Nucleic acid binder design. Structure first.
Ligand SMILES: [Cl-]
Ligand SMILES: [Cl-]
Ligand SMILES: [Cl-]
Ligand code: NA
Ligand code: NA
Ligand code: NA
Length: 323
DNA sequence: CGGCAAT
DNA sequence: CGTAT
DNA sequence: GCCG
């Protein structure tokens, strides 16, 4: 199979869930130690298993597979033979991993901040609440709605939110469209947030749209916290409500297919796609466009299909970008 | 060994 | 530093 | 951690 994740279809569900989940724990643990190189490899190795057409049953089936060296193969070997991987289980139990994972999942908290808190003796959320003086407003909101934000967002929630966003956007700018992106566009049934991409058919009209959208959303009393906009929405529930992370992104229609591709993901898929573009095609890709450094020109795109064709890749629908 | 996406 | 895919 |  191809070495780049953007060269292979990766469905949301596959046939090596257990194996890939173990490797991603090591990737997650690697990122907690600042080992971005090791995180990347373990992520790649896990994605390879996701792309396989059938379960891995023997170690010999790992031969030839990209990004599977000594360490990753050792992990799979133990899992196939003993049902568990000793290193993986040791990571799970450790106070370091559980704390870092707990801290980093807080909105407004990254690895660097989490590590510093761990080195100061902080272990729980109430520890962070015990000293609100050294908390930023984004972190204060992160701890404030942490329980709700830790609750999976369902498809039914997305539909309600999109109906809300479309209403505000529509009143903010006639003709402006709202596109669901993120993991939910890839076909996920549950998520930790909702991502929307907003544009307008007439180039330039999308300028200064977000403040108008946010104002009309706040007027409806739907914003607990907030061109991009990282918001925490108040989502109506049966007899109550819960907080939901929502991201609003505005782009000109000329750059829309690039913004759509980037914000649909997955994270690893986009990294592999941009790595492929530069290393194999000598082209520079981001959320805004595709640049030819030699010709000093930007590729024009009307769709995601255009971009894939520019890069010489077979088209992959969003539901096959779950790398 | 240098690179690892990109803003 | 944080945020997004 | 893996790759060229
Ligand atoms: Cl590393
Ligand atoms: Cl899902
Ligand atoms: Cl498109
Ligand atoms: Na976080
Ligand atoms: Na998001
Ligand atoms: Na998301």
């Amino acid at each position: 199979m191809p070495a780049y994740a953007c060269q292979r279809p990766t469905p949301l569900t596959h046939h090596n869930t257990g194996l890939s989940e173990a490797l991603e724990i090591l990737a997650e643990a690697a990122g907690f130690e600042g080992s971005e190189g090791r995180l990347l490899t373990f992520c790649r190795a896990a994605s390879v298993l996701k792309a396989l057409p059938s379960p891995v049953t023997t170690l010999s089936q790992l031969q030839g597979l990209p990004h599977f060296g000594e360490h990753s193969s050792r992990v799979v070997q133990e899992l196939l033979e003993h049902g568990v991987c000793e290193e993986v289980e040791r990571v799970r139990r450790s106070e370091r991993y559980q704390t870092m994972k707990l801290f980093t999942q807080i909105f407004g908290v990254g690895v660097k901040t989490a590590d510093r808190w761990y080195r100061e003796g902080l272990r729980t959320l109430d520890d962070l609440r015990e000293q609100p003086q050294k908390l930023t407003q984004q972190q204060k909101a992160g701890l404030q709605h942490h329980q709700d934000l830790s609750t999976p967002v369902l498809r039914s929630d997305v539909d309600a939110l999109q109906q809300v966003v479309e209403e505000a956007v529509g009143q903010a700018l006639p003709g402006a469209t709202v596109t669901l992106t993120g993991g939910f566009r890839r076909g996920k049934l549950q998520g930790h947030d909702v991502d929307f991409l907003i544009t307008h058919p007439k180039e330039g009209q999308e300028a200064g749209l977000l403040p108008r959208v946010m104002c009309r959303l706040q007027d409806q009393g739907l914003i607990l916290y907030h061109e991009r906009s990282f918001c925490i929405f108040r989502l109506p529930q049966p007899g109550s409500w819960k907080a939901v992370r929502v991201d609003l992104v505005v782009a000109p229609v000329s750059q829309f297919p690039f913004a759509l591709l980037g914000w649909t993901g997955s994270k690893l898929f986009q990294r592999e796609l941009r790595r492929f573009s530069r290393k194999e095609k000598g082209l520079w890709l981001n959320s805004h466009g595709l640049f030819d450094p030699e010709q000093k020109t930007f590729f024009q795109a009307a769709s995601e299909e255009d971009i894939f064709r520019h890069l010489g890749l077979e088209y992959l629908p969003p539901e096959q970008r779950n790398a």
